[PDB]
Amino acid sequence: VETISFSFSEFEPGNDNLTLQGAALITQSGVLQLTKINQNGMPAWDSTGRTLYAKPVHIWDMTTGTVASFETRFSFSIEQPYTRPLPADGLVFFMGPTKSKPAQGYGYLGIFNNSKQDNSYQTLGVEFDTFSNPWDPPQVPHIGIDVNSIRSIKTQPFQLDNGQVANVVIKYDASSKILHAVLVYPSSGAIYTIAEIVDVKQVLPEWVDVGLSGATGAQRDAAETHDVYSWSFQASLPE
Amino acid sequence: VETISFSFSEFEPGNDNLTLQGAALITQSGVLQLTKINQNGMPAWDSTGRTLYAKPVHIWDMTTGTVASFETRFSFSIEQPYTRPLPADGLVFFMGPTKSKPAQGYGYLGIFNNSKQDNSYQTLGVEFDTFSNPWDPPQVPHIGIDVNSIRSIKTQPFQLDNGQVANVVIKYDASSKILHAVLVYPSSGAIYTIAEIVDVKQVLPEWVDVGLSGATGAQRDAAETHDVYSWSFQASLPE
Ligand SMILES: OC[C@H]1O[C@@H](O[C@H]2[C@H](O)[C@@H](O)[C@@H](O)O[C@@H]2CO)[C@H](O)[C@@H](O)[C@H]1O
Ligand SMILES: OC[C@H]1O[C@@H](O[C@H]2[C@H](O)[C@@H](O)[C@@H](O)O[C@@H]2CO)[C@H](O)[C@@H](O)[C@H]1O
Ligand SMILES: [Ca+2]
Ligand SMILES: [Ca+2]
Ligand SMILES: [Mn+2]
Ligand SMILES: [Mn+2]
């Protein structure tokens, strides 16, 4: 059985097990800031940042025809300090081609180049979208399962607890091909769940990079924070 | 689209919207005790209790072939006061034939007569099993999805936060036929998730009773508490 597994109770500058891209930064206090925060403490607009695990993970194998089961957990907080305009854009957990660089920002969240449904993206993501683009449902924020497109195949509205930490658990069972994600707000006790069928074998390449990406709006002050406090990942490829 | 929906922030004695069977009792303080508790505050062994919603719900319809989507949420606490013998047996959220009476106790949790997988049982349950019977995996407690049998088709171990309150969310999506359940322990922040594919129209009858059932062990002190503090349910049948 081939297994990959990492865990971060917190983050520390320089940890060579993490690849930072764009605005992604690790404060001295241990928190990972995906998008830029000005020195006055306010989140900056027109910002995009991502963090990947330095090592690719074997998600499935052609020869044997088997696919791995995985689980990831992380905590984050989104703070929307401005009244107007509307905050943007959200953050995502994603698995895609190895050696990837940041794509388009804003509504694309740093992982897509446009709103097309294109299988060549070979990307899977679970988004926490805070801005309603023309391809989004009217409700925001919302959890969404993204398969080769920013236009989610499944969506679940949730209420933001401004500035509070949320716990996320994303799990994939190769057996039934079910991807189930859950979001919890310890502060209010709120629990959100979402599940959909995803055939990883038809979406992702055999090896993929796993990471987190966040982005702020395309206009002045259409921004919010995208802070991550911890992150763990585990995958098991049978045989 | 016929919809059924109820919610109990707390329980009140006499409320004719709930059917109590076996040992099930509602205290003056508003908590629902599925299994018996002696006057000295200790849980009694050899006890079985169930609570059914007083009205059947329409889960699917032959005519149209449409099946409903539902969601249920409840809070409970299991307290295992004795060191030995091992505590038993657990509690279940279940849907089954209407006008039913409690079945066998102990490991059968009051909803099955034996461990046989039989379609005539027409019972679906999400269990929180605290005792490992011959048909159970070695780990307890565990969440299990029961389809016409006490021998779960899917199992997920979880760590009991003895005596503390747990929040449960069980959701079923007719579209994908996915049953996803999540258990959360506010006290420790633990989050457990489990999901499996279940085709409700090949398992349950058109109309069903929805309820909660709990049971304590077959020998002295093989007992624990099975208290429920709140419970809500909702189902939507298209057309
Ligand atoms: O306001 C936040 C959103 O901006 C959208 O882009 C807008 C832009 O803000 C506006 O000035 C003008 O250029 O129209 C654009 C729409 O194409 C982003 O697309 C959206 O993701 C948010 O960032
Ligand atoms: O001890 C709790 C478990 O008891 C099991 O039944 C036992 C019984 O306790 C023992 O005295 C003897 O009769 O063997 C039985 C096994 O068949 C229950 O089956 C189990 O559910 C627990 O309640
Ligand atoms: Ca969006
Ligand atoms: Ca058992
Ligand atoms: Mn979206
Ligand atoms: Mn069991």
From Swiss-Prot, chains A, B:
It comes from the Eukaryota. A minor C-terminal proteolytic processing site is observed at position 268. Keywords: Calcium, Glycoprotein, Lectin, Signal. InterPro entries: ConA-like_dom_sf (IPR013320), L-lectin (IPR016363), Lectin_LegA_CS (IPR000985), Lectin_legB_Mn/Ca_BS (IPR019825), Legume_lectin_dom (IPR001220), Leguminous_Lectin (IPR050258). Glycans are attached at residues 17, 113. GO terms for molecular function: carbohydrate binding. Disulfide bonds: none annotated. Binds one manganese (or another transition metal) ion and one calcium ion. Galactose and N-acetyllactosamine specific lectin. Belongs to the leguminous lectin family. Homodimer. PANTHER family: CONCANAVALIN A-LIKE LECTIN FAMILY PROTEIN (PTHR32401), LECTIN (PTHR32401:SF45). This is Lectin. It comes from Erythrina corallodendron (Coral tree).
